[PDB]
Design an enzyme around this catalytic site. Sequence first.
Site, PDB file in Angstrom:
ATOM      1  N   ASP A   1      81.710   8.017 -12.347  1.00 25.60           N
ATOM      2  CA  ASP A   1      82.697   7.519 -11.399  1.00 25.60           C
ATOM      3  C   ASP A   1      83.723   8.598 -11.072  1.00 25.60           C
ATOM      4  OD1 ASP A   1      84.369   5.159 -10.121  1.00 25.60           O
ATOM      5  OD2 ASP A   1      85.716   6.149 -11.540  1.00 25.60           O
TER       6      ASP A   1
ATOM      7  N   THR B   1      85.838   8.298  -4.110  1.00 22.92           N
ATOM      8  CA  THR B   1      86.593   9.497  -4.452  1.00 22.92           C
ATOM      9  C   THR B   1      85.764  10.761  -4.261  1.00 22.92           C
ATOM     10  OG1 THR B   1      87.746   8.151  -6.082  1.00 22.92           O
ATOM     11  CG2 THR B   1      88.068  10.510  -6.159  1.00 22.92           C
ATOM     12  N   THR B   2      84.523  10.761  -4.753  1.00 19.61           N
ATOM     13  CA  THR B   2      83.699  11.961  -4.654  1.00 19.61           C
ATOM     14  C   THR B   2      83.432  12.322  -3.202  1.00 19.61           C
ATOM     15  OG1 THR B   2      81.654  10.691  -4.796  1.00 19.61           O
ATOM     16  CG2 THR B   2      82.640  11.443  -6.858  1.00 19.61           C
TER      17      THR B   2
ATOM     18  N   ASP C   1      84.258  -1.427 -10.925  1.00 16.60           N
ATOM     19  CA  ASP C   1      84.066  -0.888  -9.583  1.00 16.60           C
ATOM     20  C   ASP C   1      83.315  -1.869  -8.695  1.00 16.60           C
ATOM     21  OD1 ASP C   1      85.424   1.473 -10.140  1.00 16.60           O
ATOM     22  OD2 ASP C   1      83.617   2.472 -10.878  1.00 16.60           O
TER      23      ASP C   1
HETATM   24  N1  ADP Z   1      70.570   2.777  -1.894  1.00 18.52           N
HETATM   25  C1  ADP Z   1      71.245   3.760  -1.253  1.00 18.52           C
HETATM   26  N2  ADP Z   1      70.624   4.585  -0.386  1.00 18.52           N
HETATM   27  C2  ADP Z   1      71.287   5.562   0.251  1.00 18.52           C
HETATM   28  N3  ADP Z   1      72.599   5.803   0.091  1.00 18.52           N
HETATM   29  C3  ADP Z   1      73.344   5.052  -0.749  1.00 18.52           C
HETATM   30  C4  ADP Z   1      72.689   3.964  -1.485  1.00 18.52           C
HETATM   31  N4  ADP Z   1      73.635   3.384  -2.239  1.00 18.52           N
HETATM   32  C5  ADP Z   1      74.797   4.043  -2.006  1.00 18.52           C
HETATM   33  N5  ADP Z   1      74.624   5.038  -1.121  1.00 18.52           N
HETATM   34  C6  ADP Z   1      75.684   5.954  -0.644  1.00 18.52           C
HETATM   35  O1  ADP Z   1      76.501   6.383  -1.733  1.00 18.52           O
HETATM   36  C7  ADP Z   1      77.853   6.516  -1.295  1.00 18.52           C
HETATM   37  C8  ADP Z   1      78.837   6.113  -2.387  1.00 18.52           C
HETATM   38  O2  ADP Z   1      78.642   6.922  -3.540  1.00 18.52           O
HETATM   39  P1  ADP Z   1      79.900   7.353  -4.442  1.00 18.52           P
HETATM   40  O3  ADP Z   1      80.766   8.267  -3.615  1.00 18.52           O
HETATM   41  O4  ADP Z   1      79.371   7.819  -5.772  1.00 18.52           O
HETATM   42  O5  ADP Z   1      80.681   5.968  -4.684  1.00 18.52           O
HETATM   43  P2  ADP Z   1      82.255   5.888  -5.014  1.00 18.52           P
HETATM   44  O6  ADP Z   1      82.808   7.277  -4.834  1.00 18.52           O
HETATM   45  O7  ADP Z   1      82.742   4.880  -4.004  1.00 18.52           O
HETATM   46  O8  ADP Z   1      82.317   5.406  -6.438  1.00 18.52           O
HETATM   47  C9  ADP Z   1      78.002   5.644  -0.063  1.00 18.52           C
HETATM   48  O9  ADP Z   1      78.573   6.410   0.999  1.00 18.52           O
HETATM   49  C10 ADP Z   1      76.601   5.222   0.316  1.00 18.52           C
HETATM   50  O10 ADP Z   1      76.331   5.619   1.659  1.00 18.52           O
END
Ligand code: ADP
Lengths: 508, 485, 483
Positions: free
Chosen positions: A43, A76-77, A377
């Site tokens: 995360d 965040t990432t 989350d």
């Molecule tokens: N099954 C999936 N296939 C393709 N892209 C995905 C999938 N699930 C999530 N994503 C992408 O991952 C991104 C979120 O990842 P991340 O930045 O690690 O989450 P956060 O930072 O919100 O904890 C989203 O922009 C989404 O487009």
Amino acid sequence: QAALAVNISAARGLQDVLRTNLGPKGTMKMLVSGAGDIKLTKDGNVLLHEMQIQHPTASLIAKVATAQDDITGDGTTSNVLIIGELLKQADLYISEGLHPRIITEGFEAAKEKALQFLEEVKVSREMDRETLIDVARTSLRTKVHAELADVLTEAVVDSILAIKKQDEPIDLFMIEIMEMKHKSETDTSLIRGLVLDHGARHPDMKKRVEDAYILTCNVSLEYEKTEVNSGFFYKSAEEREKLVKAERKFIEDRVKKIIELKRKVCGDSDKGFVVINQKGIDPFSLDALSKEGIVALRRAKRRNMERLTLACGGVALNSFDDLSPDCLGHAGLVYEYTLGEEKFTFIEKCNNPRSVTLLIKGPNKHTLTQIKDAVRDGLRAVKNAIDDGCVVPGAGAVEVAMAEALIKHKPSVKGRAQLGVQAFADALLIIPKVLAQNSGFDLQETLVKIQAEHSESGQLVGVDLNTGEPMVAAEVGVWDNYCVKKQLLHSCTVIATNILLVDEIMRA
Amino acid sequence: SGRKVQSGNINAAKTIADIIRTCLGPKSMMKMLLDPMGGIVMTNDGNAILREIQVQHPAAKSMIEISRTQDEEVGDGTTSVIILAGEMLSVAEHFLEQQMHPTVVISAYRKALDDMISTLKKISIPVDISDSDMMLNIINSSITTKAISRWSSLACNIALDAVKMVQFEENGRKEIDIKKYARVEKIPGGIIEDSCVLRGVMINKDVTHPRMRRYIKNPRIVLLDSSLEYKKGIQQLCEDIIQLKPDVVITEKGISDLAQHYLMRANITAIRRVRKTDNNRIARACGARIVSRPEELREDDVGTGAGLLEIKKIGDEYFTFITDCKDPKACTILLRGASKEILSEVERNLQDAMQVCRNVLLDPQLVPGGGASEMAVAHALTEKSKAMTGVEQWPYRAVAQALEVIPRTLIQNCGASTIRLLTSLRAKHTQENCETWGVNGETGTLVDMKELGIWEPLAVKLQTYKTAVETAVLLLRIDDIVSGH
Amino acid sequence: VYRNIQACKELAQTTRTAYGPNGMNKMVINHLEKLFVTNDAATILRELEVQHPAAKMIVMASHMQEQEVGDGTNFVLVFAGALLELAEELLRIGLSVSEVIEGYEIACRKAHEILPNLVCCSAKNLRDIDEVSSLLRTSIMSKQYGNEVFLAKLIAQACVSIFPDSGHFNVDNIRVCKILGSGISSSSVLHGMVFKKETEGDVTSVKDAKIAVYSCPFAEELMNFSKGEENLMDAQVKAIADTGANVVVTGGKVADMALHYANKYNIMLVRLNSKWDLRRLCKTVGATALPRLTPPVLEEMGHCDSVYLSEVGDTQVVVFKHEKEDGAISTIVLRGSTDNLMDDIERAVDDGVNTFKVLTRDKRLVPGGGATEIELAKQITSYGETCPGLEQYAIKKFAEAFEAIPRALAENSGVKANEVISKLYAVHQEGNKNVGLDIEAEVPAVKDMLEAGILDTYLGKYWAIKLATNAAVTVLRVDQIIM
Ligand SMILES: Nc1ncnc2c1ncn2[C@@H]1O[C@H](COP(=O)(O)OP(=O)(O)O)[C@@H](O)[C@H]1O
Ligand SMILES: Nc1ncnc2c1ncn2[C@@H]1O[C@H](COP(=O)(O)OP(=O)(O)O)[C@@H](O)[C@H]1O
Ligand SMILES: Nc1ncnc2c1ncn2[C@@H]1O[C@H](COP(=O)(O)OP(=O)(O)O)[C@@H](O)[C@H]1O
């Protein structure tokens, strides 16, 4: 002149470090403490909070990013990657003149256009179980093992759907996560009601209490004696050895007051008199009250007591008397559970069914923490999705569409702000590229395929993170939070502008 | 040392193989030559890369020498030979560290080579001979992707006529062919269309004063290494020549006008300042004999050669035409143009197609290129190793898994990923039994080579595989280098 | 990531040799400077100062395997090491880590369902001491030397078959006591907890007795002081001897006056209490520790059944048998030249009794000695071609990872590994599953284990494979951390 280059390099380095975490296929990172403790997680918030960052401006970027992310759900990432690519694109032109104010104006114009476009792109699909299942899946597969995420989706969505009955934004207090170290991690579900951390040393008081009443009020079966007389057992030993007595009379008086309350409001020895104390209680009076059907418990923290007040009710004070039964509350089932050596108090079927806890049984400490953060989350993501009532396609999709809108909007703006607009667009291109890279495919090939498919389709199309071909996120079921995208654009623009506006580094 | 010298030899092999590993296929990458003066050379050919570079290890020198000897023997494929040898010697590293002897590795390699020979001869597509259709198809396949695409219309028919000019009928049916006996006539000037063919030897030298009976309707050539002088006081040799009564006698010394008259008294035409590479082909095409010892002089000293002689001074230069030779094994081919920068390459590729044709006479077979043959034989070996047991099965399988380097580099120097494409190529090459697909060198996409239209001669592929395996076994057979440094 | 794989490789190599019955035992020195010689891999890992966080994951996986099955730890170590080696070479080929992870998971899923298809289960029950002991032979055969296995199996089985009640077993019930001196053959099976004692004023026929536990081990003016000390000591011994107390234990030494006052109450004086014995007594009889002499009470006092002196083993011992269950506790007496080999034998006995406990809840037996590993490797590598795509490489590497166990088991037995692996794999097509690796012959020969009776439990193999695969996967999903 050079401070700008230093900041660009540091932001690029931070982006490179955080690059291999975006997407459900991203590789986790391991955080080893100085003591020796190990934490394995992905995360963005916890990585930025717990990392031992060296570069000062990188630490600044991390601090502001986590501070702004505390507002919205997550993202965040992606925010850090977008900041890094924004800085690199801006520097690409600043190297040939382009006083940073021009790039800043381009950035703000592109931000306005992107916010507008996101307004016309959002989907206002209604409330149902399946869309929130998909939202939970999207928010969970990006944090934990796939099958474990599939297991957790049902529990999280059901908990939030149950809490939704009030028709107001509510969370956090009303959903609590309990910690325990069972060997089998498969056991994970919702526990409607409340689970206490631990019980007390009691031989078979009631087991299945069934219907009972709760009053708490921190019973004083081990009431505070007069031990503190002068320091310790000095030459005047008869004080701390004999004057320490005459307080057991107070304990017995409290026992008769509890007796009066029990056989006054209960009407019989049944209908358990549930009470909890913040400190210990002697086993003698404990079993004496247990034989009368009184549910006496001890050694609990505050938070469970305020939770009981809003769920069941009851005052809390160590020294008390025969108070009115107004604060008394009732619970449908006060069953007590025990697993091996630790005992659990399942306060279930209570009034105010809003209070609900979740069960997790991870084998070790770090898996437990990872599951807890993933659940948190997911809960935040589903809460946001319900609150705004609008969701946007994920897997990029919106990024490339905003890029096309910005590029076609580039000639509209006047001056040199077209450079800033182009830099902003190429920066928003980073997310689909990072997803494709982390999947294992080629950056530009996948990006070209996605853009070409979006060209004559019009509909939002994203990256399929198992085969690399373009996919429409609406049909597959990948969704993002509209508020997350709003906060993402705002924060990335603000931080990139602030980093770009600097011109000199001096000690202080 | 022990196996340390083996590891050193194969490490030198690997570090010399990957130097030119990138410069094969239709999209070869360029290389940089930095001589210690400052000059810089653009290069696509790995042969020149190895020739110009300097090496210190005897193993590398031996492999370079074997690559050369393959180059001037069969023609092309030197880069493929080097790549394959390096790959097998590199995959032998795993077994040489298993503390297991090089001899069993060698035996496994030999078995693998035999099985690859068998499976190539099984998978090869047949081609017709003396038919211009698939001859031009082979021209489109291999003779293309060279500097001939603008002049293929002439190179093709030049080769197709040239196929029947160097045949020896010694032991079978036209199976013997010699390489330098074709009378090459490369002269710039005029249009390239002036290049043609002629059955006979074409000699660029001529008599200073051709005021004598130079051409006779039945040249009975006699070769002599003696020098013609004024007279006996040597006319004695001429008098002895008169005994058998020839019409043309070939020498290698100058002739004077009075010497010319003394010769035409015997009615014999001599030549001067000629080359041995011309005299040998003259004798081959005429079936003459050289002898001067009086005791050995018999009726066999005169051998009838051509049947028609002619001299033409095309552009005030002394040509000599010897047409209708007795043996059509050394005959004239003509080359015309402006500069020899490309016509030499077109020529050499044409005699490459000539070798293709003679092997077609031996084995009229073509192997699918573009990595099709490599993956086909790799599949054949891998499915063959399932039945066979023993400790040598691992090298047997590893040779197969190593020979797929050619399609891997074809994909690599094209842009496309070398992992997914190779996996897909194998997938449609194992369960798909009767396909033998390949990879397109241009776009980097899998395509059935029966449709793309690329094929290679069987003989060149066989020679490349055999030389690679023999190089690998030779480098595995060397147990000590030390005779000094 | 290659740094993590290298660290795991080194940690797997350092315990690779100890695998199998011919395991090369290592010298062990701990922080308090002893000198062990042990072939038990779990013991080696205990004294290894493992600091690399990547190898810590594999160590935790091994601990979980031991904590649940109690054997196959070194199998987990070597399997994870081989898996990481092959994953590293796959990464060097160019495959992404995600594809390797997916392939490993698919291969493990396939192996988990292939495994129960090659089982030759137990004969009839945990009873029939000879037969069940024959089942329990292989674990002790491997963990300690292969010579005295025929006797160690009987010793370790006669004790555990005492109480096969309701199909429930506990490891802590079968306790082990040290009695130095004569050889291992002099060991036998006894009932109830046992240790040393000093006095002889003991009564044999005892009803439910009373244990006293001591957590804290022991000119006229001079005469008056001596009298005061004597009277205080007499008052204390009377206060501890009240309420009909009959037995007393203390962690200190004997005193002539103290033993005299104990005997004048017809009470024996038991001394030489170890730092670990008091907790075992308290849990076995429900007793408690009394710090000083002046607070003895009837309630804070545990109950035994029979106490008497046994001369078995050429020495005097005490027995606390016939507890509340009257048969639950069952000790094993051990005899040896020194204490260094005592620990090896106790670990062998534990590694046998826990296998018996596993067998209690699962009667399935699997042909050991590399038979099941090579069978699984063949099955998985055959399934690999049936699966096109990018996961075939990882599946094949999983098969080659199973290939590692007989390889190690041979190379740590003075036999060419490649030769025996090839012979095993070739025979295994026709000379099917029940064939394995022969240890006796120096020539690399093979031998059937169904006839030879070399078998290992199904549940142990299943759990070990699962845990090793999980450890490899969870260590492949780590990028880096500053160190
Ligand atoms: N099954 C999936 N296939 C393709 N892209 C995905 C999938 N699930 C999530 N994503 C992408 O991952 C991104 C979120 O990842 P991340 O930045 O690690 O989450 P956060 O930072 O919100 O904890 C989203 O922009 C989404 O487009
Ligand atoms: N159009 C094409 N498409 C795919 N592969 C080709 C093509 N043309 C040639 N090749 C490949 O090139 C290889 C031989 O080229 P190379 O060995 O570099 O030339 P040379 O033999 O002169 O050194 C053959 O294996 C053939 O498969
Ligand atoms: N006599 C034998 N011949 C061949 N293999 C054996 C023999 N005895 C035991 N083995 C094998 O050696 C292995 C020993 O496992 P072990 O090292 O004891 O694991 P752990 O130390 O974790 O309990 C067993 O899996 C068994 O298959």
